[PDB]
Amino acid sequence: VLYVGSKTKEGVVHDVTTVAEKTKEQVTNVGGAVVTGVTAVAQKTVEGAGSIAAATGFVKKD
Amino acid sequence: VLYVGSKTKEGVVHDVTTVAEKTKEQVTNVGGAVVTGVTAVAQKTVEGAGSIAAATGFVKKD
Amino acid sequence: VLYVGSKTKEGVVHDVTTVAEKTKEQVTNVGGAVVTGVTAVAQKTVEGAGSIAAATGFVKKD
Amino acid sequence: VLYVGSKTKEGVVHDVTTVAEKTKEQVTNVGGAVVTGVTAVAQKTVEGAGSIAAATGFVKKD
Amino acid sequence: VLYVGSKTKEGVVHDVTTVAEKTKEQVTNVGGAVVTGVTAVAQKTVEGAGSIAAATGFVKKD
Amino acid sequence: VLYVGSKTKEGVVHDVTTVAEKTKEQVTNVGGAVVTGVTAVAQKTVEGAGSIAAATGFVKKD
Amino acid sequence: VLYVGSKTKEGVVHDVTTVAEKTKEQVTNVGGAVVTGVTAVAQKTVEGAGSIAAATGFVKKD
Amino acid sequence: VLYVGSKTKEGVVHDVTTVAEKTKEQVTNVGGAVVTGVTAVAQKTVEGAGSIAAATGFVKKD
Amino acid sequence: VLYVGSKTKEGVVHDVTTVAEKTKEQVTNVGGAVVTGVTAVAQKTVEGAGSIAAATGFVKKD
Amino acid sequence: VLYVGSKTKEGVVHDVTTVAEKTKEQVTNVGGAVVTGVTAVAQKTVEGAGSIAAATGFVKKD
Amino acid sequence: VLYVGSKTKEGVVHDVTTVAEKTKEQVTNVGGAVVTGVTAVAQKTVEGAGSIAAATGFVKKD
Amino acid sequence: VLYVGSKTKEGVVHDVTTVAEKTKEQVTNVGGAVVTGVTAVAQKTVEGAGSIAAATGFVKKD
Ligand SMILES: CNc1ccc(-c2ccc(/C=C/c3nc4ccc(OC[C@@H](O)CF)cc4s3)nc2)cn1
Ligand SMILES: CNc1ccc(-c2ccc(/C=C/c3nc4ccc(OC[C@@H](O)CF)cc4s3)nc2)cn1
Ligand SMILES: CNc1ccc(-c2ccc(/C=C/c3nc4ccc(OC[C@@H](O)CF)cc4s3)nc2)cn1
Ligand SMILES: CNc1ccc(-c2ccc(/C=C/c3nc4ccc(OC[C@@H](O)CF)cc4s3)nc2)cn1
Ligand SMILES: CNc1ccc(-c2ccc(/C=C/c3nc4ccc(OC[C@@H](O)CF)cc4s3)nc2)cn1
Ligand SMILES: CNc1ccc(-c2ccc(/C=C/c3nc4ccc(OC[C@@H](O)CF)cc4s3)nc2)cn1
Ligand SMILES: CNc1ccc(-c2ccc(/C=C/c3nc4ccc(OC[C@@H](O)CF)cc4s3)nc2)cn1
Ligand SMILES: CNc1ccc(-c2ccc(/C=C/c3nc4ccc(OC[C@@H](O)CF)cc4s3)nc2)cn1
Ligand SMILES: CNc1ccc(-c2ccc(/C=C/c3nc4ccc(OC[C@@H](O)CF)cc4s3)nc2)cn1
Ligand SMILES: CNc1ccc(-c2ccc(/C=C/c3nc4ccc(OC[C@@H](O)CF)cc4s3)nc2)cn1
Ligand SMILES: CNc1ccc(-c2ccc(/C=C/c3nc4ccc(OC[C@@H](O)CF)cc4s3)nc2)cn1
Ligand SMILES: CNc1ccc(-c2ccc(/C=C/c3nc4ccc(OC[C@@H](O)CF)cc4s3)nc2)cn1
Secondary structure (H helix, E strand, O other), X not given: OOEEOOOOOOOEEEEEEEEEEOOXXXXXXXXXXXXXXXXXXXXXXXXXXXXXXXXXXXXXXO | OXXXXXXXXXXXXXXXXXXXXXXXXXXXXXXXXXXXOEOOOOOOOEOOOOOOOXXXXXXXXX | OOEEOOOOOOXXXXXXXXXXEOOOOOOOOOOOEEOOOEOOXXXXXXXXXXXXXXXXXXXXXX | OEEEOOOOOOOEEEEEXXXXXXXXXXXXXXXXXEOOXXXXXXXXXXXXXXXXXXXXXXXXXX | OEEXXXXXXXXXXXXXXEEEEOOOXXXXXXXXXXXXXXXXXXXXXXXXXXXXXXXXXXXXXX | OOEEOOOOOOOEEEEEEEEEEOOOOOOOOOOOEEXXXXXXXXXXXXXXXXXXXXXXXXXXXX | OOEEOOOOOOOEEEEEEEEEEOOOOOXXXXXXXXXXXXXXXXXXXXXXXXXXXOEEOXXXXX | OOEEOOOOOOOEEEEEEEXXXXXXXXXXXXXXXXXXXXXXOOOOOEXXXXXXXXXXXXOOOO | OOEEOOOOOOOEEEEEEEEEEOOOOOXXXXXXXXXXXXXXXXXXXXXXXXXXXXXXXXXXXX | OEEEOOOOOOOEEEEEEEEXXXXXXXXXXXXXXEOOOEOOOOOOOEOOOOOOOOEXXXXXXX | OEEEOOOOOOOEEEEEEEEEEOOOOOOOOXXXXXXXXXXXXXXXXXXXXXXXXXXXXXXXXX | OXXXXXXXXXXXXXXXXXXXXXXXXXXXXXXXXXXOOEOOOOOOOEOOOOOOOOEEOOOOOO
16 A cells, blocks of 8 residues: 555544524523534544444433 | 655544624523533544443433 | 655644634523533544543433 | 654644634533533543543533 | 654644633532633543543532 | 654643633632633643543542 | 635645656757756746746747 | 634645656756756745746846 | 734745655756756745846856 | 734745655766755845845856 | 734744665766755845845856 | 744744765865755845855856
């Protein structure tokens, strides 16, 4: 294997633009999960027999 | 293997722009999780048989 | 293996821009977790059989 | 292995810009965790069978 | 292994800019943890079977 | 191993800029931990089976 | 005018890759100009009533 | 005018890669100019009524 | 004008990589100019009514 | 004008890498100029009505 | 004008790497100029009506 | 004007690395100038109507 004058991207996020002008929110969470932001996960490898990689709003409850 | 004048990106986040002008929030969390920010996780490797890498708003409760 | 005049990025975050003009928040957390900031995790390796690497808003409770 | 005139970044954060003009907050935390700052974790390796590396807003309670 | 005229960064944070003009906060923490600053952790290695490296807002209570 | 005219950074923080103009805070902590400063931890190695390296806002209480 | 989290390129050259394997040249210039290299000019502004900006192989002779 | 978390490039050259393996040259210049290298000019402004900015192989002779 | 957490490049050269393996040259210049190296000029401003900024292989002869 | 946590580069050269393995040259200059090295000029300002800033291989002869 | 936690570079050269392994030269200059080294000029300002700043291989002869 | 926790570089050279392993030269200069070393000029200001600042290989002869 060899790379000459090249590039690679094995899991990336970019150019995430967010313009929020004159907003209003009123969240009233009482249990559980409310996720109203801007998230950006970027992984290369997640092994493991049960891994819950990259969760956003998870309520895993017995 | 060899790289000459090259580049690599094995898990990255960049160019995350956030313009919030004249906003208003009223969150009233009472239990659980409220995540209204700007998050950016960037990992290369997560092993392990049960790992919960990159959680955002998790409520894992018995 | 060899790298000549090259570059590598195995887990990175950059160019995180945040412009918040004329905002207002009113969070009233009473238990749990409220995360309304700007976070940036950047890891290379997380081993271990149960690791919870990169949590943001976690409530792991029995 | 050898590197000539090259660079490496195995877990880094940079160029974190935060412009907050004319804001107002009113957090009233009563138990749990409120994290409304700007955080930047950057690790290379986290071993261990249960490690909770890079937590931000954690409430791990029985 | 050898490096000639090169560079390495195994866990670093830099270029953390924070401009806060005309702000106001009113935090009223009564138990738990409120973290509204600017934090920057940068580690190379964290071993140990249970280590909680890089916590910010932790409430680990039985 | 050998390094000629090179550089290394195994856990560092730099270029932490903080401009706070015309602010006001009113923290009223009554128990727990409030951390609204600017922190910068930078370690190379943390061993030990339970180490809690780099805590900021910790309330570890039974 | 203002730019937020943006970029500009007013005259640039990049990603010039040149792979020359097992070549042979025999140039026998006797007057004039022979230019068999790799050139990359990049200017922003060239004023002047007669300017000959960015010449490569010029023989301007009376 | 103002720039926040942005970038500019008003005349630049970068990522010039040149791989020359097993070559042979025989230049026999006898007058004039032979330019078989790798050149990279990068200017911002060249004024003047007759300027010959960025010449490579010039023979300007009366 | 003002720049916050930004960058500028008004005339620059970078990332000039040159790999020359198993070459051979035989230049026999007898008058004039032979330029078979690697050059990198980088200027910001060149005034003057006749300036010959950034010449490489010039033979300006009456 | 003001710059906060920013950077500027008004004429610079960097990251000039040159790998020459198993070469051979035979230059036989007899008058004029032979320039087969690695040059890097970097100026900010060159005034003057006739300045010949940044010459490399010049033969200016009447 | 003012700069806070910032940087400037008004004419600089850096990261000039040169790896020459198993070479051989045979220069036989007989008049003129042969420049086969590694040069790095870095100026801020050159005034004067005729200045020849940053010459390398000059033969200016009547 | 004022600078707080900042830096400036108005004409500098640094990080000039030169690795020459198993070389051989045979220069036989007979008049003129042969410059096969490693030079690094770094000036801030050169006035004067005719100054020849930063010459390397000059033969200025009538
Ligand atoms: C050919 N026959 C076979 C073949 C395969 C199998 C087989 C394969 C995989 C598994 C995995 C079982 C798991 N159990 C848990 C419990 C909890 C948890 O995470 C808890 C939480 O707190 C963390 F987020 C993650 C996991 S994965 N079981 C059986 C059986 N028989
Ligand atoms: C062929 N037959 C087979 C094959 C495979 C299996 C098999 C494979 C994997 C597993 C994994 C079991 C786990 N249990 C927990 C509990 C808690 C936890 O994390 C707790 C929390 O506090 C941390 F976030 C993480 C984990 S992973 N079990 C059985 C069985 N049989
Ligand atoms: C083929 N058969 C097999 C194969 C595999 C398995 C198997 C594999 C993995 C596991 C892992 C069990 C764990 N338990 C805990 C408890 C607490 C915790 O963290 C507590 C918190 O305070 C820290 F955040 C983390 C962990 S991981 N168990 C069984 C069984 N059988
Ligand atoms: C094939 N069969 C197998 C295979 C694997 C296993 C197996 C593997 C891993 C584990 C890990 C168990 C842990 N328990 C704790 C408790 C507390 C804690 O941290 C407490 C807090 O204060 C610090 F943050 C961290 C940890 S990790 N258990 C069983 C069993 N069977
Ligand atoms: C194949 N079978 C197997 C395989 C593996 C295991 C196995 C592996 C790891 C563990 C770890 C157990 C721990 N317990 C604590 C308690 C408190 C603490 O920190 C307290 C706080 O004050 C500091 F922050 C940290 C730790 S880690 N246990 C069992 C069992 N069986
Ligand atoms: C294969 N079977 C196995 C394998 C592994 C294990 C195993 C591994 C690790 C551990 C660690 C147990 C610890 N307990 C404490 C208590 C307090 C503390 O710090 C108190 C505070 O004041 C300081 F901050 C730190 C620690 S770490 N236990 C069991 C068991 N079985
Ligand atoms: C409405 N009527 C008008 C309007 C416009 C004009 C008009 C406009 C431009 C010009 C330019 C004339 C020039 N002459 C030279 C000579 C040599 C040289 O460079 C020499 C070499 O060594 C450098 F590389 C560059 C230049 S530009 N002339 C007349 C006349 N009438
Ligand atoms: C409306 N009527 C007008 C309008 C415009 C004009 C007009 C405009 C420009 C010019 C320029 C004339 C020049 N002459 C030289 C000679 C030599 C040289 O450089 C010599 C070499 O050694 C350096 F490299 C550069 C220059 S530029 N002339 C006339 C006339 N009439
Ligand atoms: C409206 N009418 C107008 C308008 C404009 C003009 C006009 C404008 C510019 C010029 C420039 C004339 C020059 N002559 C030389 C000679 C030698 C040299 O450099 C010598 C070498 O050794 C250094 F490298 C550089 C220069 S520039 N001339 C006339 C005339 N009429
Ligand atoms: C509107 N009419 C106008 C307008 C403009 C002009 C005009 C403008 C510029 C010039 C410049 C003339 C020069 N002559 C030399 C000679 C030698 C030298 O350098 C010698 C060497 O040794 C150093 F490297 C540099 C220079 S620049 N001349 C006339 C005339 N008329
Ligand atoms: C509007 N009309 C105008 C406008 C402008 C002009 C005008 C402008 C500039 C000049 C410059 C003339 C020079 N001559 C030399 C000689 C030798 C030297 O350096 C010698 C060497 O040893 C050092 F390296 C440098 C210089 S610069 N001349 C005329 C005429 N008329
Ligand atoms: C509007 N009309 C105008 C406007 C401008 C001019 C004008 C401007 C500049 C000049 C400069 C003339 C020079 N001559 C020498 C001689 C030798 C030397 O250095 C010798 C060596 O040993 C040191 F290295 C340096 C210099 S600079 N001349 C005329 C004429 N007319």
